[PDB]
Design a protein around this ligand. Sequence first.
Ligand SMILES: Cc1cc2nc3c(=O)[nH]c(=O)nc-3n(C[C@H](O)[C@H](O)[C@H](O)COP(=O)(O)O)c2cc1C
Ligand SMILES: Cc1cc2nc3c(=O)[nH]c(=O)nc-3n(C[C@H](O)[C@H](O)[C@H](O)COP(=O)(O)O)c2cc1C
Ligand SMILES: [Fe+3]
Ligand SMILES: [Fe+3]
Ligand SMILES: [Fe+3]
Ligand SMILES: [Fe+3]
Lengths: 403, 403
Amino acid sequence: MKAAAKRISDGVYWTGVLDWDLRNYHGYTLQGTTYNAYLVCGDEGVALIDNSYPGTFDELMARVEDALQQVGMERVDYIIQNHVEKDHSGVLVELHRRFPEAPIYCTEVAVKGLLKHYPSLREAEFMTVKTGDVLDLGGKTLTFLETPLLHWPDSMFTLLDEDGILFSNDAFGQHLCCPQRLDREIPEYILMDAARKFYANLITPLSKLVLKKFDEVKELGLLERIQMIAPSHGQIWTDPMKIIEAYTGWATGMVDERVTVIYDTMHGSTRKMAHAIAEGAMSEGVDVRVYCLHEDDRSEIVKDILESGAIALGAPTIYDEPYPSVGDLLMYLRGLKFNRTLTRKALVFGSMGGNGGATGTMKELLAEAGFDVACEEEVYYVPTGDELDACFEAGRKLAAEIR
Amino acid sequence: MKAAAKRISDGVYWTGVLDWDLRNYHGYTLQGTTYNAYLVCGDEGVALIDNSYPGTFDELMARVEDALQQVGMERVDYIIQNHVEKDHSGVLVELHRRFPEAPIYCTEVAVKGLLKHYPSLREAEFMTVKTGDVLDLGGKTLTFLETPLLHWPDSMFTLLDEDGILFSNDAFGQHLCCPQRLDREIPEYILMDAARKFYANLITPLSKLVLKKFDEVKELGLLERIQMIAPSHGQIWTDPMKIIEAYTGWATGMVDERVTVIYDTMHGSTRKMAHAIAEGAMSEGVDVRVYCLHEDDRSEIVKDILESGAIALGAPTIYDEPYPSVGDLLMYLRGLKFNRTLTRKALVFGSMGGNGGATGTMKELLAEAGFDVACEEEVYYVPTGDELDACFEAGRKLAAEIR
Ligand SMILES: Cc1cc2nc3c(=O)[nH]c(=O)nc-3n(C[C@H](O)[C@H](O)[C@H](O)COP(=O)(O)O)c2cc1C
Ligand SMILES: Cc1cc2nc3c(=O)[nH]c(=O)nc-3n(C[C@H](O)[C@H](O)[C@H](O)COP(=O)(O)O)c2cc1C
Ligand SMILES: [Fe+3]
Ligand SMILES: [Fe+3]
Ligand SMILES: [Fe+3]
Ligand SMILES: [Fe+3]
C-alpha cells in the first residue's frame, strides 16, 4: 500500500493514520480525526512513538516503511507506548509480530493496561520507565516524564532533547483530519476551536493537575527546550506557546463575557422562556449562545460552557422531574467539574402544569456539578407578557453579574 | 375541504384528525398518531367531546360538519374538554369563535389551565363540572367523572350509560395513525404493543391511581355495562375488556419471564459484558431484550421494562461517573416509578480502567428509581474469558430469580 511519511525534523517522521470518516468518537462529535504516531531515527536505532486504531496497521506500516526508506534504516528497534487507550495501542500486537526484537517502553501501570487489552503480549519484552529515564538512540535521546491522570493513570510524555519535540499523547490534541500536518497550515479558528473542544471534554477535570504539571515541567527546566508539541490527535504545534497559553487560560477559568442558554421543551413554553432569557442577556452587550438538548450534542454544549461565565438550564416538568434529556448533560457535567477552573453562575428555569419540581432537581444537580445557582424562573404553562418580561430581567441580571 | 366523519354508534361519530407525519411526541417515538374528537348528538342538543393540535381546525371542522349533515343537526351546542393539553385543546379558540353560543364543559381545575393557555377565552362561558354531573342532550345523557392525576390534574372522563360508551381521553390510548378506526380492524400485535408503550411511558407512575379508579367506577355501578372505550388517541376499543384486563395486569405487575439488558459502551468492553449477561439469561429459557443507549429510544426501552421482571444496566466509567447517557434513562425511570407495580430485580455492570465508580452510582440511582439492586459485575478494561464466564453466571442467576 502507498502512503507517505511526513518529515517534521531531522530523523523525526510523522507516521500516523488519517481517519476521514469518524463522526462520533464515544459521545464526542467530530469531522474525522487522526491517530498520530511518530518515528524517531538516531544513529544506532529507531523508536516508534505510539501507533493507531485497530485495523489501521497497513496504513501505519506503509508510512513507517516510507520513513525507514528515507533515513536508510532497516527496522523499528523500540516501541514506545505513551498511553494504553485503543486508538493509540490498537496495532501494538501487529507491530510486535512485525518487529519481534523490539522492546515495548511504557510506565509500570501501562503494562497491566496493555496485558489486559492484548493478552497475546504475554512474552513481549517490556521496559518499565519513570520520570527522568532516558532512551539513547545515538545522537538522539528520549526522556520520559510520567503524567498520571493526564489523561489516564497509565500515561506519560516523551521528550526528545535535540529536536525539542514534546510527544504529549492526548494532551494538546485536537480532533481534526486535514491533509496538512502542522498548526500554521490550517485556519486558526478551526485549529483553536477544535483544541478548545478537546479541552472542554477531556481536560476540564484535570485542570489543577494541568497547572501543577506546568510547574514541574518548569522546575525540571524543560519548557525552555520545547520547540515543538506533537500530540496523538490532530495538528503538530510549531508554536508550542500558543497552546500552552490557551491551556493555562482554560485551566484558570479566564473567559470573555458570555452566557450559554441550554433547554429542552415538549410544548414550547420553556423555549419561549429561553428566548426571553437570551434577549435579556443580549441587552447587556454580552455574548449569548442558545442550545436545545433535543438537537444539540453535549460535547458542543460543553465547549461553550468552558468559555462562559454563566449558564441558564431550562426544562419542563414531567411526573415531578425534569425532562429526562437534562439528566444526560448534568451527569456529564458532574464528571467534568467546571468548578475546578471557575464556579460559573447558573439560572434554572422551566414551565410546569401542577406541583412542578424540575427547577428543584436541576438546582441540586447543578450544585453537585459545581455551579452556583441563584434564582429560578418557574412558569405555570404558557408564560404571559409579564412573565416573559421576568425572564428577560433574569437573563439581564445573570449577564450583568458576569460583566 | 373534504374529510368525512365516522359513525361509531347511533348519534356518535369520530371527528378527529389523522396525524400521519408525527414521529416524535415529546421524547415518545411513533409512526403517526390521531387526535380523536367525538360528536355526540341527542334529540335536543349536540356535544363535541375534545378537539385537536393547533392549526388542524379545517380538518376537524370538516368532519364535524359531515357528522352534522349526516345526523341532521344545525351546529355544536356544547364544547367538552376532558384534558387541557394542547393536542386536545389546540383548536378550542376556533371552536368558541365558530360556535359563540356553545358553553365549554370542563372541571374546576381545567378552567385555570385553559385560561392560561388561551387568554382569549376570558370572555367565554364556562360550565364547571364535577363527578356525578350530567349533561342532558334529549334521550342521550353524558355523565362526567373526574380523574385527577390520571393523566393530568385537570383530567376527566365523559360517559354514555344507556349506550355504555366511555370517553376516556388519554386513558387506554395508543399512538397509531390508521385509516381504520376500531381496534378490531387492525393486527392485535400492533394494537397491543402500541397500548403497551403508551401505558409504560404515560400511565406507569399513575398505576395505583388506576386501580382505585377502577374500584370507584365499580362502587358507583357504571362499568358492568361497558360496550366501548373511546380514547383521544388511536383505535376505538370495541372489545373494552381486553384493554381493561391488560391495564389491570400492567398496574399490578403481572409479566411473563423476561430480562431486559441495557448498556452503553465506548470501546466495546461493556458490550461484551452485556452480551454475556444476555447469554446467561437465555440459558434459563427466559425471554431477553438487549438495548444500547447510543441507538435506542427511552420510550422503547421502558415499554420492555414494563413487561420485564428483571433488568441489567451497564456502562463504562468516565471521570468517576457512568457514561452520561445513563443519566437520561435513570432520570426518566425516576419519574415513571415502576415500583408502584413491581419492585423489579436489577443487575449493574460495566468495564473501567482505574478506580471505577459507575456501577456504585447506578446501583444507588436504580434503587432510587424503585428497583431492587444487589450485585455488580465490574471488570478492569477488556474482560478475560473467566470474567465473561462470571458475567454469564450473573445473567443466569438474575434470570433464575424471576422464574
Ligand atoms: C408527560 C406529562 C407529564 C407531566 N407531569 C407534570 C407534573 O408531574 N407536574 C407538573 O407541574 N407538570 C407536569 N406536566 C405538565 C407540563 O410540565 C406543562 O405542560 C409544561 O408547561 C410544559 O412546558 P413546555 O411547553 O416547555 O414543554 C406534565 C406534562 C406531560 C406531557
Ligand atoms: C474519557 C475517558 C475518561 C475515563 N475516566 C475514567 C475514570 O474516571 N475512572 C475509571 O475507572 N475509568 C475511566 N475511564 C476508562 C474506562 O472506564 C475504560 O477504558 C473502560 O474499559 C471502557 O469500557 P467500554 O469498553 O465498554 O467503553 C475513562 C475513559 C475515557 C476514554
Ligand atoms: Fe486517551
Ligand atoms: Fe487519544
Ligand atoms: Fe395528555
Ligand atoms: Fe393526548
